[PDB]
Ligand binder design. Structure first.
Ligand SMILES: CC(C)n1cc(C(=O)c2cncc(N[C@@H]3COC[C@@H]3c3ccc(F)cc3)n2)c2c(N)ncnc21
Length: 278
């Protein structure tokens, strides 16, 4: 093992973002010039808020992932007050940024990024890991414009937590259980948001959004790519055992074979040149 890193090994730079229990800061390792996104978590706050399980799971899940469509965890260390996780620096930021910037994706762009997401979910589910809070804010983009999915402290590892309201699956509201097919529901919402520019269930507060989700209350705009609409319809299904991609629907084969993805080559997407946005 390389020796444990420590804060004095880095020149810390700008804050990349701030969350409830952590802050992500750009850092340059002095010995190498390499840049990392270092997530910094204060131990007292985690302990006080009973978040030890989530921080431990984040580290344990990330250390298991070895795939190009996920943020990598390179190292961890801690001082008296703080934990530090050394992550890949995804230089192009959140997918959410591009959706806002561009408005909505054309069909080529929608299909390519949707295929990367499906391919990442196939890998994650194959290891028995459910993300449980998938959304455009934690699907990051590297400097080559491939995805890197992050934000694993809320993940479930298969042998309590409700995600961002827009992407919450009806089973979490109707019987508090999560399964692989909950991530496929979020996938449906994300595909919808790429094409439409907005997520499918929106309202002025969380209670109202939850009410639309359990009623399957959303509509497609007139413009929506027909094969993408057909795919979203087969993912936003109330019954979690009937979503394309789930085990009871015979898994990722039938999803990857959906007509929306006809021209996709699945085997080497990360070596393909992404289509330019917009
Ligand atoms: C875009 C920027 C902020 N950013 C984030 C990166 C992470 O890895 C990461 C890790 N855990 C969660 C998370 N996002 C969570 C989803 O919604 C908000 C919440 C949140 C939570 C804490 C926080 F501090 C910022 C955002 N992101 C990253 C990176 N690796 N490389 C380049 N930039 C990066």
């Amino acid at each position: 093992q390389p020796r444990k890193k420590r804060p004095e090994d880095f020149k810390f730079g700008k804050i990349l973002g701030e969350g409830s229990f952590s802050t992500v800061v750009l850092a340059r390792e002095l010995a190498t010039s390499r840049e990392y996104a270092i997530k910094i978590l204060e131990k007292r706050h985690i302990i006080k808020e009973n978040k030890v399980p989530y921080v431990t799971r984040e580290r344990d899940v990330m250390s298991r992932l070895d795939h190009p469509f996920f943020v990598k965890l390179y190292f961890t260390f801690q001082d008296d007050e703080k934990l530090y996780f050394g992550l890949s620096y995804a230089k192009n930021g959140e997918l959410l940024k591009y959706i806002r910037k561009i408005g909505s994706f054309d069909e080529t762009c929608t299909r390519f990024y949707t295929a990367e997401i499906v391919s990442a979910l196939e890998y994650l589910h194959g290891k028995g890991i459910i993300h449980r809070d998938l959304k455009p804010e934690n699907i990051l983009l590297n400097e080559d414009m491939h995805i890197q999915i992050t934000d694993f402290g809320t993940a479930k590892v298969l042998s309590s937590f409700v995600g961002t309201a827009q992407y919450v699956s009806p089973e979490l509201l109707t019987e508090k259980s999560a399964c692989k097919s909950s991530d496929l529901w979020a996938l449906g919402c994300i595909i919808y948001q790429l094409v439409a520019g907005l997520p499918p269930f929106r309202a002025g507060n969380e209670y109202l959004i939850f009410q639309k989700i359990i009623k399957l209350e959303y509509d497609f705009p007139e413009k929506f790519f027909p094969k993408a609409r057909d795919l979203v319809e087969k993912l936003l299904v109330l019954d979690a055992t009937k979503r394309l991609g789930c085990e009871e629907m015979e898994g990722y084969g039938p999803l990857k074979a959906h007509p929306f993805f006809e021209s996709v080559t699945w085997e080497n997407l990360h070596q393909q040149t992404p289509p330019k946005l917009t």
